[PDB]
Structure 1
Amino acid sequence: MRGQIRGLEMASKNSQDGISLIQTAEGALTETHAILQRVRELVVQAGNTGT
């Protein structure tokens, strides 16, 4: 019992920390995304400016 219980608590802890990891990753991807949006803007403008 106490084995499964203690390791369970550590498993939920582990889980919340895994969450935090992927939140960091996805925040980096939020700014990645922001830049790519900006690039798209610059390509639209680029397409008009091509002539």
Structure 2
Amino acid sequence: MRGQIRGLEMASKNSQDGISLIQTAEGALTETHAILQRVRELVVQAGNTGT
């Protein structure tokens, strides 16, 4: 039991650490995405306003 208990404590630890990794990459990709919104703004402008 205690072997598993302690393993579950370190499991919770490892999973929370998983979450930390996730949210790191998550926020980074959110910012990336926001850039890409700006990019498409610049694409539509980089329709040259036509000519």
TM-score of the alignment, normalized to the shorter chain, above 0.5 = yes
Per the normalisation by structure 2, the TM-score is 0.90
Shift of 1:6: 0.2
Q: What is the alpha-carbon root mean square deviation over aligned residues? A: 1.1
Q: Which residue of 1 aligns with 2:17?
A: 17
User: In proportion to residue count, which structure has more helix?
Assistant: 1
Q: Distance in 2 between matches of 1:50 and 1:4?
A: 67
In the alignment, structure 1 segments of 5+ residues that lack a partner are none
Poorly superposed stretches of 4+, deviation over 6 Å: none
**TM superposition shift of 1:48:** 4.5
Is there any run of 5+ residues in structure 2 with no aligned partner, and where? none
TM-score (norm 1): 0.90
